[PDB]
Design a protein around this ligand. Structure first.
Ligand code: A1AWV
Length: 334
């Protein structure tokens, strides 16, 4: 209905979006643009080959459904959806509020302890909302976090993985890195890595590989207790852990020198090896380190999310009809 235009290392689309500049030509690409109607700077994601197989058609539908159901200040909020193709029988695009820049190029600059408080509070306030819809992030690296000059923070994901530029394994939880089991606390492990890297300014677990990563993590959190060893669903990995020369639990006070006491304490809470023992997003919000901004009423919980469709593995063709239904019925926010 609106007028579309074309331009190219990929081709792009309505008239309202101008000044297209590239961002990420990842495996599945993205553009940063300016929406003339709202007057905001927007991020425009284009899904390449969304229907070449039912698997990334499932990804397509999953993405749109989720982004539609996502409405949180600290989480990406869908703005527009459109296609130039001329009928339901016929590329697709996603638009969202574009924050200043990710967190990579800002770890290198400026941080005070209160800035870390505000940042990690935004992240945990987003993760409460995410986990209360029974959704797990997994890929919670700094480059998937959006920030602007006002230190506002929006959570995000365009991994767009298996790495073995900031390597992803450095922030992946031990158990999800070795399929030992997992509950949502893997994201909290990532948060611990991130807060530590901010306060200390350097990588916490700069693992060169799976093995080196694991060894670095243990050199801090120590070897597992007799209990946690039971929790492993891998007898080869079990014998390997039991073989590693035991490592005692280091005192985080020794490591996080000159760090806010409450900061070191929360780090103690967010880096428990046992998945069923780490602190939860809400329990961390309740932490005194965030009592400056901690507001239980200003930390809403996402309404239920109907994920029933995952078991519905449909034909190659008909899934685009349901994706089209979810496209046309989109409702922009005033
Ligand atoms: C199979 C599958 C599909 C999707 C997801 N999934 N899950 C999540 C959550 C939050 C729930 C974890 C988010 C997503 N998907 C995206 O976040 N897609 C990016 C995207 C979406 C648009 F609607 C519009 C533009 C987009 O690209 C961007 C977005 C932010 C940007 C830029 C540039 N700057 N910034 C800000 C700072 O960098 C570009 C998971 C699995």
């Amino acid at each position: 209905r609106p007028t579309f235009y074309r331009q190219e290392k990929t081709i792009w689309v309505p008239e309202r979006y101008q000044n297209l500049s590239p961002v990420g030509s990842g495996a599945y690409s993205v553009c940063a643009a300016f929406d003339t109607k709202t007057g905001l700077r927007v991020a425009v994601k284009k899904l390449s080959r969304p229907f070449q197989s039912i698997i990334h058609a499932k990804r397509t539908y999953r993405e749109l459904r989720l982004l539609k159901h996502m409405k949180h200040e600290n989480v990406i909020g869908l703005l527009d959806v459109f296609t130039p193709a001329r009928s339901l029988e016929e590329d697709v695009y996603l638009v969202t509020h574009l924050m200043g820049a990710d967190l990579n190029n800002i770890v290198k600059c400026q941080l005070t302890d209160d800035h870390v408080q505000f940042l990690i509070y935004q992240i945990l306030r987003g993760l409460k909302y995410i986990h209360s819809a029974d959704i797990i992030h997994r890929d919670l690296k700094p480059s998937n976090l959006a920030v602007n000059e006002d230190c506002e923070l929006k959570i995000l994901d365009f991994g767009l993985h298996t790495d073995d530029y900031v390597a992803t394994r450095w922030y992946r939880a031990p158990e999800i890195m070795l399929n030992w089991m997992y509950n949502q606390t893997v994201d909290i492990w990532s948060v611990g890595c991130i807060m530590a890297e901010l306060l200390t300014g350097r990588t916490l677990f700069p693992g060169t590989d799976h093995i080196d990563q694991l060894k670095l993590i243990l050199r801090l959190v120590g070897t597992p207790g007799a209990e946690l060893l039971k929790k492993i669903s891998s007898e080869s990995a079990r014998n390997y852990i039991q073989s590693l020369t035991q490592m005692p639990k280091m005192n985080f006070a020794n490591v996080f020198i000159g760090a806010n006491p409450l900061a070191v304490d929360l780090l103690e809470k967010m880096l428990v090896l046992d998945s069923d023992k780490r602190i939860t997003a809400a329990q961390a919000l309740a932490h005194a380190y965030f009592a400056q901004y901690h507001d239980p009423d200003d930390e809403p919980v996402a309404d239920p999310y109907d994920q029933s469709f995952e078991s519905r593995d449909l034909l190659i063709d008909e899934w685009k009809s349901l994706t089209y239904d979810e496209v046309i019925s989109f409702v922009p926010p005033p």
